[model samples]
Target: MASVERDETREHRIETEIIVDAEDKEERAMGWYYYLDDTLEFPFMGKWKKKSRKTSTIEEKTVEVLGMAPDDECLKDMYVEVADIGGKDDDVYTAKLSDIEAIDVDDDTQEAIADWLYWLARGYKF
Candidate 1:
C-alpha cells in the first residue's frame, strides 16, 4: 500500500461516506459496502497491483472491473467483480479491490477507489 498522510478533508468524507450513522464493525462494513456499490461506475479497466499478496495468474492480473463482489466477500476487504481478463469470456472473476487500481475511469470512480485505499492504509477500524 502506498503511504499517504492523513488528510482532514478525506477523513471527513470517510466519516460521511463510510462511518456516519454506522456503529459497530458489522454496520461499518455495510456502510463501506453500500457506499462503494452506489458510487463506482462499472466496466472500467484496471490492473493488478497485488504483488504483496499472491495467488493469481497472468490472465487474471488485468481486468475490466465489472462491479462489486458479493456482500459477504466484502466484509473483511472489498472485492471487485471483473471480466475480459486476458481474453477470457464473460466468466466473471474476483479480486481484492485494493489490489486493483482503476486505470481507465472517471474522476468520481477514481475518488471512490482512493477513499477505500486511504481507509485501508490508515488501518482505521470501525
Candidate 2:
C-alpha cells in the first residue's frame, strides 16, 4: 500500500475587502489572491492587503461602482471615500467591485505594486 497526495493546481480567485469609515468619511479597500497550489510560494510584496487608518476622523457617505464577478459581494456595501497617501490632498476616487476594471500598471510605482500583488497571488516559482 502507498500513500497518495492530492493535486491542487487550479485557477486563482481575487478577493477584495472594502471598509467604509463614517466618522472619517473615507473608504479603504484591499485585494488578495487565492492560489490552489498549496506548496506554491506567494510573496505579496507590494500587494496592499491592508491599509493604514485615514488621518481624518470625519466620515461621510458616498457612492461606489464596482465591476467584477456576479457572486463577488466585496463592494456590495456602502460607498466610502478613500484616503490619499502622504496626507496629500488628492482627488478621491470611488468605485464598486463590479465597476472596477483591470488596467495595466505601466508606471514605475503602479508597476511595482502590480509586481508585488502578482507575486502574492501567483509566485516566483512559475
TM-score of each: 0.79, 0.19
Q: Which 10-residue window of candidate 1 scores lowest in summed lDDT?
A: 52-61
On residues 34-114, what C-alpha lDDT tens digit does candidate 1 reach at each position? Answer: 978888887788886656545553333668888889888887778888875756856877888888788879899898888
The candidate that achieves the highest lDDT relative to the unseen native structure: 1
TM-score of 1: 0.79
lDDT score for residue 27 of model 1: 78
lDDT of 2 by residue, 1-126 (tens): 111212333212121211222112112222221111111121111111222338634332222212122223322222223323323425444322112112332354334333334433453222
Off by over 4 Å in 1: 1-3, 7-9, 52-60, 87-90, 124-126
Q: What lDDT score is found at residue 23 in candidate 2?
A: 18
Task: Quantify how close model 2 is to the true structure by its C-alpha RMSD in Å.
Answer: 17.4
Error of 1 at 5 (Å): 2.8
Alpha-carbon shift of residue 1 in model 1 (angstroms): 13
lDDT of each: 0.77, 0.26
